[PDB]
């Protein structure tokens, strides 16, 4: 038993383990998208970017868990990463479809994980998933529920022309 | 024979030859399709700028292998320059797939002439076809092939509005 | 069949798509023993350091695959990442030796890589492999044998205080 | 017919048209004479960039008559751009020579351009080939026949130190 | 055998090591000359700075390859030097022509080491060939080239002024 | 005879160009050390730092020499530099004892050399020696004193940890 372990539930820590999986899955899932986007048949650069750069930040929200294991005197354990769900997108609207799906399913993780230590006790535990996590799933799934909601309105998926307008303005 | 002539076999330096003159000839289409899009019927003043700026580039390619046949001991033979195939490109469309379309024969020529080189033993004259012309190539179809996919998926060549906006958001 | 695609084979396309999963899991690698350091009872700061940044170093080579593979023409497929070998790597000398190991499989697939490629006559992903993972492999194999030879002249493993003046002079 | 065409005759049309060739042309030439003084058997690397520097100047004349012909609503039509004359201009003396001659020849094609806008009545015409063209013209063939006596007053083509010391003193 | 050692042939190893020599070799040639031109009966300052840095350059294209040698997980295994071959080179006329002669067998050498590496399947010598070692020979034959015929056209050897002349102007 | 010679002893110019030699022989004993060094087997990058400075030095003293001997109307004379003593020397306590030696048998053939210049009473040499390489050769035989007592205090050879602390702190 670690040296710095307190108040420290086996049950937390293996939630924990889950959920760095999750993240990783997730910046893969993005990764994936991104490179859509870079086809030359797709060729939408700002899709592309808006992605890539949601695959770093998935990571670095999988690193900060890791972090927070070692800090609370858990052993990570890692599992294989998934290929994601997809090979083709059909659309960029179907992508912030998907995406918008993935991130609230993170959020339902994230709020089983909030409720697994609010029964362990862990008022640490309960601040972090607070602090760094919650509000910023709330900020995400706004954010790609107005995406979905614009591209809509506009026109697409059967508008190329509201996608390539959309990749320009919204997200250049 | 030349001073400075080393395992440069006569076969090589042919093929150099028609190489330079079949990028003097991509110098002059480029040029051709630049002034296209200046006419007062046609008026995309930055489809105009993107082919004279290809243009230039193409004569500046032609001027790096002068330089390489100097430098390996060669005599430069100049072919006469064929006008271009067309005197009206149709679209910003139709200028984009010719374009798309005369740098795959471009691509064909040099992995031709690399094949001669590996073959004749040459393998200064492979890295420099590798260093200089091969990537460059493949970077530029890859361009053309995402233009000519956002103007289709725009709505181009029947949509002016399409090609007016591509004019401004991707080539300004 | 993709309107940028030339002289590129059906098997390239394959082994690229396997050569992308390789980096993608030697980042995965390189992230699970960055944070085996990072342990409490491990407590070797730099050592976590030097095996991140290597993390982050790897998922960029394998980004540069996907944007060739684009750039090429092929599709991007994605398979699983496999969770890495070992959760406890005994101490920074195992690490380093592991690293050894997997900067060698890793330099063994892109060798093989580049003998398909020459023999299905592709210049330019012959001179991709060349210019951007093969002189960077030789410089990691060798930087990581060294820093093993060290680490063995030193006394580790069995001596704490060598890996403890290793992190701090040459890995800090 | 065009929507700007104003007091612009046929003829001057089809004038502008084979200057625009005249100017190409007179690019080529300059541009052949560059690469034969980069020769190692010749070395004169001033020679090289004042005819260089001459080439890339005579491919801007010419894009400004393709300029003024869509300025007055003409439509340009390309001709095939005929090898220079000589592969093997033997001195700079002999270069310098040829050179004088070209540029006579491209303001005699000048004057005779001025001559029919005059009888065609078209004043801007008139103006913009005295303005652009003509006084250029008169300086290049005064530097040029410049050139041709210091080169003859030195001992050239037979001695060699005069045409080294002129490439030194003189163009550069 | 080496920990870092892969794909490398005992054949290429030795190779490398008479590749080392011979510019060291070259580096004591150059320094030979230089200081021939620092005579008080030769007197030419240019000759001997560009005879010094010419040297000065090969000793630092030999420490290259050792470092590769290192690098690959070969061993060193240095030869005498051997004295250059003359004490006194007449002219500036015959030194450019000897270091022309040097530069060409050097670079036969290295085309030879690039043969056996692509027999013996070593893309990552290959390449390093190509990138640090091929460009340069040719670089630098041609500009040896041009200064012999420089040399010679302003009427070396027998001319003292031509020697000077060259000496202010071309090296200087 | 030479133009400037006074006073300059044929026994003196033969001494010189056999002192030229042996800083040759010492500059390449240093280059031989400095890539053992940097071997993966042995790896301490300073140590291999501080005997390519060594090496670039000794080339440096005997240009130096070389510039005196046609500064006093002799005449050069190159030998064959012989190959250094060791391919393997075992330590960084070895490579430093060796060094020590070298230094002073270099000294000890300068002070021959003063020894034959005072007899041949040629002042000028005599201060030419004493200025540029007597003391330079007793600092440099106490700084490696210095190194070898501190190597040898601090348990080299048998104490890999003791080299490698060496290495960071006293030539780092
Ligand atoms: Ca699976
Ligand atoms: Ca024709
Ligand atoms: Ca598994
Ligand atoms: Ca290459
Ligand atoms: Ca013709
Ligand atoms: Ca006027
Ligand atoms: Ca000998
Ligand atoms: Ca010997
Ligand atoms: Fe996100
Ligand atoms: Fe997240
Ligand atoms: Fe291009
Ligand atoms: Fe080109
Ligand atoms: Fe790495
Ligand atoms: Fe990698
Ligand atoms: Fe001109
Ligand atoms: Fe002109
Ligand atoms: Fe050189
Ligand atoms: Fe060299
Ligand atoms: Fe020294
Ligand atoms: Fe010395």
Redo the contacts between chains.
Sequence with gaps: T???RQNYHQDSEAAINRQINLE?YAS?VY??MS?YF??????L?NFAKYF?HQSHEE?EHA?KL??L??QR?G??????????DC?DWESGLNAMECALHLEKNVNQSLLELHKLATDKNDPHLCDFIETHYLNEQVKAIKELGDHVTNLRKMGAPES??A???FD?HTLG
Tied chains: 1, 2, 3, 4, 5, 6.
Excluded: C, T
């Excluded at 870079?38 to 060729?43: G, T």
């Excluded at 052993?75 to 994601?84: E, G, H, T, V, Y």
């Design positions: 670690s040296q710095v990783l893969y990764l994936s490179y870079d086809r030359d048949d797709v060729a650069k890539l990571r690193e890791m972090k294991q070692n005197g052993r990570i354990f890692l599992q294989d990463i998934q290929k994601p090979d190329g022309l996608e390539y307008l320009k």
